[PDB]
């Protein structure tokens, strides 16, 4: 499996034309399974699930979708609330794979669009794995912005690879996991024209007047499938506290914590990660 | 696998000779994993863990003992603090069958015990697997004591059958699984006059001049095994929020909360609970 | 003061003649501020408020309403969500009595009813204390119902001095306050037609299609007021994990906690209680 | 009140003579008082409580005493465990002062200091007032160092102005309180060679044999006293999960959250702290 084996592109409809870049493996499964990467600038599909993608690829069939204004996907200059926006992008590929009610892994942002897709298109939506995700989260505890939301803000202010390497700094536990080789990469990615175009449309779409949207907490209670909620002890950027008013309300929810394990659950403990997924969505 | 055919004596010390009954199985299993149960007056291993033995007996070499006060293990008058006490006589076993330092799986007061044996025998103890234990368990938000220990703490004093299903009713969140049989069965050993002066002993030992040792919590930060705690969301015995001061200071520590499932998790999740158990103890 | 010297009747209009029975206490002073009671069913504003009314009274102009259902305002066999019912009784009373913006006090279910008057007439709340209360509150940690609302249930099913006791005995850390006058006093109301009546109505508006007014933790977040929750640490009806949405989302909250306090916390801690309220009405 | 008018110096012996700058007011007032400051670089005395010794002063006999290492007390180039440190030398100060059982007030390490203070020396400590306090601490949520101690831990290892305002701007809510004054005036005292020197020694006694000492949490049960725990919601160096073990554990704890309030409780919200505090205080 490569990055280039597994490209994939589609178009669809959100307001108007819209592509999609997406990773697809392990065609012959029987059961499909989206992912949906995290928020950081220089992510995608490909990075984000690199130690994930074939493995569930062995017992999935696994599209790994880039999220609007990520990786390969459409960069918009303007958008609504982000969840509710990739939500109906994802309605519009779900339609056009035929695809019917699947399951989704989400992780930070793309665990918000998870959920939000889960209740806007109710139907659409199998069991949910949220790893650190956003949206559903509502830090109970811990001052906003946390410490990671704002290291992300300061490199969306001021795009130097100094504050690019603090923002991945508190991503992870082993901070040894932060190399110049990985700084250097996901810079390149992060400070493209395109990119920025995407934090900047990120930025104006948080004082939009559908902030409600991206309040989930107020509304999985609604949520009728397993959900299993994933954490990292020491996640920085959405944390621990987060999780809570989420196990409380989902009726089948399951929350697993990992110690020393930061906001990268499927980086740092990626083997319990694939595995409790794999078990998970019965395969 | 029977009662019977597993079923094993061992006599340790424990300031003089104490009688510990168990049942093994999966021998040739190269493995071996001890089991702890929980702490219901008609409590011992082969009900606690009747759909767990058979099953983990399939990856391990299975010793499921029954803690000093019940089942058919001596049923003294008198001791110091209770997980200290059946420390001891865990210890005096793990000797006498040339154990080095095998994993613990235990549940409630059972929980206790392993924690208890992991400090003050630490070179001995391996991974942990605790479902609602005690002992490291502090609640920092339900008053205490708890609906759970006040409703075993009014059987003790009044042993009556409906004061018994009270109790079991509250083990569970599927309270149908709490059957006139279920009841009739827990009732027969619970108030038989052994049972009767462990549960009079247990008392006495809360009021003794060690009851540091039962306050685990200040001392589960110098564990430096991974340590699995699972905990049922609606545990009415042993509540959720008392899952998190170990989870914040036991380095390996991990925590996997299921819901609606109550404070028998062995039970109300038994194939989810023991697939966690075989997968964390490496079989 | 006297029950007799303060009693004061209402008739406003709710679906239709609504009666309202009231204390009105402190006329001249220039700062209204209105108290709502706690749900056990015998309870009422004079028995709630004993330790309080006149206290308040040197500092403002007090009216502590009976709310629907309790004492003796108007005990009707059917209504909706309770709190909303209440809400809109209260709105006929503030009409009536030329009322403008106005400070409220409520604990348990009259906290609840405070709230969603405060969100359902925004402009007519003022500053908010509330001790124990429901309906903004969500137990994160303690699995529902609460041995507190359980053990009302069970007076509601089987209404014996027994079962009143038991219900009582959950109210307060120091047991003793629970003395045979006060158990015996409590159940001559509790047990009267009208109070079970009142009971029975209460029961079959918790299946009703609005019960998401009931779920005022979604919606605090759009207070705009100064809001003090009280807690007592032994709260064993809706306990102090219950605080937590309601204390980040609140913008201008506030909360007290008393160690060695349980859900009465206008009694057990009377002084620190009016004391607390005095300086945060600005008297 | 001016700094001068009030300062006071003391010799005690701490392995040696120690001296100690103090502030001393509301001398004739009955009930002696002694504050704790925070643990900033160039925190002291006079600084931190500024919001608040004149108003304590009219209340009872106030001393203000500059903790080794800070303002005008020594500042030794080695030390043990530092609240422990810091507690034998107000020891020497209370004995030289003839004072017996008398409250302490202390703020973020201040408070550190008084709990240590409580625990080694149980008859001289009276009631506790303890400001988002660090020591009986734990945050059960947030990751450690928290961006608070990390921020504190930059400036330590790179002493510029650019790193104190950074560090400055997560002590409050209101960032507006972090003036350019402000910090001019900090960083001249946070960057002489003797608060460098004291910073070299904070960050060495970190790792020393003694840090169970600093892991307050595990005793703080032992606390006979009433204790004040207030916390602001929005604390990032000691956030609000850090309060639960003690106000659990600690038997006549209260706690006191402010919505809209960082670290610095007594200059965000001095005027409801001054009246939290001398009420308390029986004052």
Redesign the interface.
């Given at each position: 499996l490569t990055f280039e084996s597994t490209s994939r592109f589609a178009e669809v409809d959100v307001d108007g034309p819209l592509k999609l870049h997406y990773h697809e493996a392990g065609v012959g499964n029987d059961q499909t399974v989206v992912l949906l990467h995290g928020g950081g600038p220089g992510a995608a599909s490909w990075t984000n699930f690199s130690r994930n993608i074939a493995v569930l690829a062995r017992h999935f069939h696994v599209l790994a979708v880039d999220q609007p204004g990520y990786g390969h996907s459409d960069k918009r200059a303007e958008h609504g609330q982000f969840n509710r926006y990739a939500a109906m992008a994802l309605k519009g590929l779900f339609d056009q794979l035929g695809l019917g009610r699947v399951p989704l892994v989400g992780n930070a942002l793309g665990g918000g669009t998870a959920v939000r897709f889960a209740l806007d298109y109710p139907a659409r939506a199998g069991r949910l794995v949220l790893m650190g995700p956003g949206g559903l989260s509502?830090?109970?505890?811990?001052?906003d912005p946390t410490?990671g939301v704002k290291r992300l803000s300061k490199f969306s202010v001021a795009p130097t690879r100094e504050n690019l390497e603090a923002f991945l700094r508190v991503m992870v536990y082993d901070k040894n996991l932060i190399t110049p080789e990985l700084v250097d990469q996901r810079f390149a990615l992060a400070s493209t024209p395109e990119s920025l175009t995407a934090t900047r449309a990120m930025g104006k779409s948080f004082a939009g007047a559908d902030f409600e949207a991206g309040?989930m907490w107020?509304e999985v209670?609604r949520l009728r499938q397993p959900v299993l909620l994933i954490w990292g002890?020491?996640?920085?950027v959405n944390?621990?506290?987060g999780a809570?008013?989420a196990?409380?309300?989902?009726?089948?929810?399951?929350?697993?914590?990992?110690?020393?394990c930061?906001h990268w659950v499927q980086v740092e403990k990626f083997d319990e990660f694939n595995?409790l997924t794999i078990?998970f969505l019965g395969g």
């Open positions: 509502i830090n109970l505890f811990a001052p410490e309040m107020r209670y002890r020491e996640d920085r944390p621990l506290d809570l008013v196990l409380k309300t989902i009726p089948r929810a399951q929350l697993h914590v990992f110690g020393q930061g595995k078990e």
